Every structure is written in C-alpha cells, then in structure tokens.
C-alpha cells in the first residue's frame, strides 16, 4: 500500500538531516518517495520566576520546539523495506511507522 514515516526531534538541523537519509535511501533502492513534508512545529512555552523569593516581574521565558517531518514511501519494495529497516538514525529523532 504505502509506508508513512513521521519524524519528531527538538533539533531542526538533525531532523531534516536524518530525513535526508530516509529520502535518499528509499529513492536509491528504487521506491516512489513523496515529501519531505514540513508539518507545523509545536512550540511549548514556559515562564518561570528567576528569583528564589519575591521579585514577580523578574522572569525567564523558554520554549521547546517540536519539529515535524512526514516521509511517504509509495512503493514498498523488499530492496527499500530492508534498506530503511537497517538504517542508523540520530538517537534524538523519534520515528513513527504508519502502515
């Protein structure tokens, strides 16, 4: 049918570099490759008080950017499935396989 890969990572120059590996490995071993589709980034913001006691206006503002990548591989060739399965990707990148 189709193999849907959803990639999540906190670093952008790590998600599209690990995505580049999946897209190149699949198009080389002969498979129809849709994407890399850049889905919206989920920005979780956090505001904390900077002082141990009192001083309400003094604060620290942080965010965690959750980058989203969608790689759709149309042709599930045995030469492509086995090549993608035995691929060494960045430890900080989460991969979701959707059948």
């Amino acid at each position: 049918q189709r193999i849907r890969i959803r990639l999540k990572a906190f670093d952008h120059r790590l998600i599209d570099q690990a995505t580049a590996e999946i897209v190149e490995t699949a198009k080389r071993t002969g498979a129809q490759v849709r994407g890399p589709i850049p889905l919206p980034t989920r920005k979780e913001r956090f505001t904390v008080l900077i002082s141990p006691h009192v001083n309400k206006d003094a604060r620290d503002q942080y965010e965690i950017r959750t980058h989203l990548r969608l790689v759709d591989i149309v042709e599930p060739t045995e030469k492509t499935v086995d090549a993608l399965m035995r691929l060494d990707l960045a430890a900080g990148v989460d991969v979701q396989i959707s059948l």
Binding site: K8, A9, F10, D11, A91, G92, V93, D94
Partner: protein, 206 residues
Amino acid sequence: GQKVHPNGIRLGIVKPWNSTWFANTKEFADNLDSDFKVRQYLTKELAKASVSRIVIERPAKSIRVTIHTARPGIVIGKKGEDVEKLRKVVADIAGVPAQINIAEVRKPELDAKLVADSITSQLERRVMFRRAMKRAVQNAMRLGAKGIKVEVSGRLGGAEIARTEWYREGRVPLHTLRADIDYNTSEAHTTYGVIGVKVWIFKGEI
C-alpha cells in the same frame, strides 16, 4: 547587576546540550529525574577521576552515557574493570539497558568544570585562594586560551566578612553569542562555609 548564564544563553548558538534525547510530556519528567539520578551516581563515584561533562542520549529504549574525562584510565580501569561495574548500576537506575562511552579531555586546564573543581579541591587543602586563581589563569593562557576569568565568592581564607574576588586575563566578550565561552561552577565546602568558584574561558569566535 545580574548576568545571564554564559552556557544557557549560547545553547543552539555555539554550545551543545548535555541531554540530547527526545520524549513526550508523558515520560519527559521521568527521564529528567533518571538523568539527575545517573549524573549524581557517576559524579560521586568518579570524583577523583576528573569528570568534566556527562552527556545523556536515549536511543529508543536504551541509555547512552558519554563520560568526558581528563583521566580515562581510572574511569575505564583494568581492561574495562570499572566501566562494567558502572554500566551495571546505570542500567539499574535508568531501568532500560546501559552503554557507557568515554571521551578524553585533552587540555584539562582549558575545561571550565575541571579548572573550577581544581580551585575548589585546592581551597579544601588550605591553599591560598589568590595562588589557586593566578595558577588557573596562567595555565589556561599559556595553553592557548584567548581569555580567562576566575571568581571566588564568600569567606576567603576564613575571613568573617565575605568577599568576591576575581582575576581576568585576555579577552572575555560575554555579549558575543558567536564567542566560544566555556562557563562552569564548583563549591568549596570549607571549615568556615561554602566558597563558590565561577570560571569563564574564551576560546575564539564562530
């Protein structure tokens, strides 16, 4: 006034994270406490083993601890004698299986955490604070540091009125995000209280 953490402000610019793993809101809290609990064990155990930095990444359902050390021989031991006993209890603390990597710290006099811990261990031996600071500055500058700053706060030499004293040599541009500023802390637990050591090492721009 109050200064921004030199390491914190440079994260993503020129400085890397000490925790590179990904987790959802679900296990993020549990992973962060496990990270603290593994760092706590190793810092206590390898205290004399000159540990400068600990990097924790989580590949799937595993833990990959990278111990940056100026003394890898004492960390590794007799043909992996000490690495095996550490990995065995890191796997117990984390729950998931453990893998320990050992990164060598070449010039430790250029590592902020190792300079800070050196000044701290010296203050506890009853060494003169000015001598400990001057030696830290001199050693870093002769080994190629573009600049260095060393601060010592609280009851210096056992004095009743606490003082904040600092030595600076070279260039220390704290406002340049492009600037490679390695910053770290250490606390000297003396017979007359706690002495805080803050070290800044400028290594060049980009």
